[PDB]
A paper describes a structure:
The genome of C. divulgatum encodes three GH1 enzyme candidates, from which CIB12 and CIB13 were heterologously expressed and characterized. Purified CIB12 and CIB13 were crystallized using the sitting-drop vapor diffusion method, and their crystal structures were determined to 2.55 Å and 2.22 Å resolution, respectively, by molecular replacement (see the section “Materials and methods” for details). Both structures revealed a classical (β/α)8 TIM-barrel fold with a spherical shape, which is typical for GH1 enzymes and is one of the most common protein folds. In the retaining catalytic mechanism of GH1 hydrolases, one of the two glutamates acts as an acid/base catalyst (Glu204 in CIB12 and CIB13) and the other acts as a nucleophile (Glu388 in CIB12 and Glu385 in CIB13). In this work, two representatives of glycosidases of GH1 family from C. divulgatum were characterized. Both CIB12 and CIB13 were active against cellobiose and lactose but showed substrate preference to cellobiose, and therefore were identified as cellobiohydrolases, EC 3.2.1.21.
In addition, the CIB12 structure contains two small antiparallel and one parallel β-sheets and six short α-helices, whereas CIB13 has four antiparallel β-sheets with two β-strands each and four α-helices outside the barrel structure. Both CIB12 and CIB13 structures revealed the presence of two protomers per asymmetric unit forming a dimer with interacting residues located primarily on two C-terminal α-helices, one side β-strand, and connecting loops. The cleavage of the glycosidic bond involves the formation of a covalent glucosyl-enzyme intermediate, which is then deglycosylated in a hydrolysis reaction via the attack of a water molecule producing the free enzyme and glucose. Both active sites show the presence of an additional area of electron density in each protomer located near the catalytic glutamates: Glu204 (3.9 Å) and Glu388 (2.8 Å) in CIB12 and Glu204 (3.5 Å) and Glu385 (2.8 Å) in CIB13. In CIB12, this density was interpreted as glycerol (two molecules in the CIB12 dimer), whereas the CIB13 dimer contained one molecule of glycerol in one protomer and one molecule of tris(hydroxymethyl)aminomethane (Tris) in the second protomer. Similarly, the Tris molecule in CIB13 was located near His148 (3.2 Å), Trp149 (3.7 Å), Tyr320 (2.6 Å), Trp423 (3.2 Å), Glu430 (3.4 Å), and Trp431 (3.2 Å). Additionally, both active sites contained several aromatic and charged residues, which might contribute to substrate binding including Gln16, Trp30, Asn203, Glu207, Tyr341, Trp362, and Phe442 in CIB12 and Gln16, Trp30, Asn203, Phe340, Met357, and Trp359 in CIB13.
Numbering used by the authors: 0 to 481
């Protein structure tokens, strides 16, 4: 047993991606409308697949939980859906919002506010989520409750009203109005589920959202990202008022590199822009300011301390899939096709590495490098909350799982405080704009019958969890991908 005893093995799940399929259809999300959009389908922006024809976890969760146990899983991260719990607006519940100029420095939810929020919530969704969380506790599951996962209620963001003349963007980013209602949602979820969860995550991969729709404007990027910082910190405070349990965030960690390691300073710049600028703000309170940016300037006013953002991060959820190689541009930087996530039309990467069915280069070395950078900068408890591959025939996933687990074992031995591993997709599910054709699951799903089928990777997973690490007789599987 290489990994420490108690190391968590499990799976991550997004509500929107896995819930619908049989009962409990939710048409009240902006992502649901994004997938049913006429322009988006005709112009190839989305696949035309529909989320309501999905894995039906809303009804089959007991079956999936037992299967998770049977393959050696003892933990999970489940994402609840804001659009399910509050189908209608919560703006009518007036709470206290403190502001220092444009800084949202505080939101306070009282017990009577929680009762008023319960009156307008969807009690059917709360009860079902409690049923899901109670079944997980019945099977001794360490439970990570993730509040937000990209999709928003239509009364928060409605893409149907948008006009394509001003850019075809989903628009699921935070404003001051959104932050206030998000704090009420965070408080209510802790008020509703705290006795059934272990830790909290305020949001999943917020950088995927605030990195888009900026028209290459760095000012719009840092300005939009500030609201996500405040969405996280205010969610943290409102949960902490109710719960004594730990609250963190789940981040998307593309491993930023330069070509043949020839530009260490550029990597430091982009790694700060894409990652540390956000985590620094909610961990130590050292954020930035957009007040003095001209529209064409690249960098923010740094060292802007905020006492209301300080110490609002208890743990870091590390999502990793591939790397991200960049070069210098007069504007700043650009990514290089043929490496990392930009391998769609590629057979092998420009480095000669295997490319997934999403067009993603397999690069387990980035996971170790991402974990070490997080450890060196923050020394916070960490959890690999997502890691997987689109692999219908399970050709690479066995070796993909082994090589990335070896990188976690090395990171731990090198000082990284990694407490568990959550593989992405226990079952195949709805992969956003790509639809159902991208199979990330350890279990394959027949979307007509909803039956789940074992891929051999699920059995390799059970062996890794049984042995508390990669046994020597399974190490050969990862050698192709180093």
């Amino acid at each position: 047993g290489m990994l420490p005893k108690g190391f968590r093995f499990g799976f991550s799940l997004a509500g929107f991606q896995s819930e619908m399929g049989l009962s409990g259809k939710d048409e009240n999300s902006d992502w649901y409308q994004w997938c049913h959009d006429e322009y988006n389908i005709k112009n190839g922006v989305v696949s035309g697949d529909f989320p309501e024809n999905g894995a039906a976890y809303w009804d089959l969760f007991r079956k999936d939980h037992e299967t998770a146990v049977n393959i050696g899983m003892n933990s999970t991260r489940i994402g609840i859906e804001w659009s399910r719990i509050f189908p209608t607006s919560t703006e009518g519940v007036k709470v206290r919002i403190d502001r220092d100029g444009d800084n949202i420095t505080g939101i306070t939810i009282e017990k009577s506010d929680l009762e008023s929020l319960k009156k307008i919530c969807n009690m059917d969704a709360v009860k079902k989520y409690r049923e899901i969380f109670m079944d997980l506790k019945d099977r001794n599951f360490y439970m990570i409750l993730n509040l937000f996962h990209w999709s928003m209620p239509l009364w928060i963001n409605d893409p149907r009203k948008r006009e394509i003349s001003k850019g075809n963007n989903l628009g699921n980013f935070f404003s001051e109005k959104s932050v206030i209602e998000f704090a009420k949602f965070a408080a209510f979820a802790a008020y509703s589920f705290d006795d059934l969860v272990d830790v909290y995550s305020t949001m999943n991969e917020p950088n995927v959202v605030f990195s888009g729709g900026n028209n290459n404007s760095e000012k719009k990027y840092y300005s939009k990202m500030k609201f996500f910082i405040e969405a996280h910190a205010r969610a943290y405070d409102c949960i902490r008022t109710i719960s004594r349990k730990r609250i963190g965030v789940i981040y998307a960690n593309e491993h930023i590199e330069s070509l043949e390691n020839s530009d260490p300073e550029l990597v430091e710049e982009v790694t700060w822009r894409n990652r540390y600028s956000f985590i620094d703000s909610i961990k130590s309170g050292k954020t930035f300011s957009t007040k003095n940016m001209e529209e064409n300037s690249r960098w923010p006013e740094k060292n802007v301390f905020r006492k209301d953002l300080e110490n609002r991060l208890d743990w870091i959820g590390v999502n990793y899939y591939s790397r991200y190689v960049v070069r210098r541009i007069e504007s700043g930087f650009e990514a290089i096709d043929g490496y990392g996530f930009l391998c769609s039309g590629y057979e092998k990467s420009k480095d000669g590495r295997v490319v997934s069915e999403m067009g993603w280069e397999i690069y387990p070395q980035g996971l170790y490098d991402v974990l070490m950078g997080y450890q060196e900068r923050y020394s916070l408890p960490m959890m690999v909350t997502e890691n997987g591959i689109a692999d219908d025939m399970d050709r690479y996933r066995p070796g993909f799982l082994i090589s990335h687990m070896k990188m976690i074992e090395r990171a731990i031995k090198d000082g990284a405080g990694v407490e568990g591993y959550l593989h992405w997709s226990l079952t195949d599910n709805f992969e956003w704009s790509s639809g159902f054709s991208k199979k990330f699951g350890l279990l394959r799903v027949d979307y007509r019958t909803k039956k789940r089928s074992i891929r051999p990777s699920a059995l390799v997973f059970r062996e890794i969890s049984k042995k508390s690490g990669v046994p020597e007789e399974l190490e050969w599987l990862g050698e192709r991908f180093y």
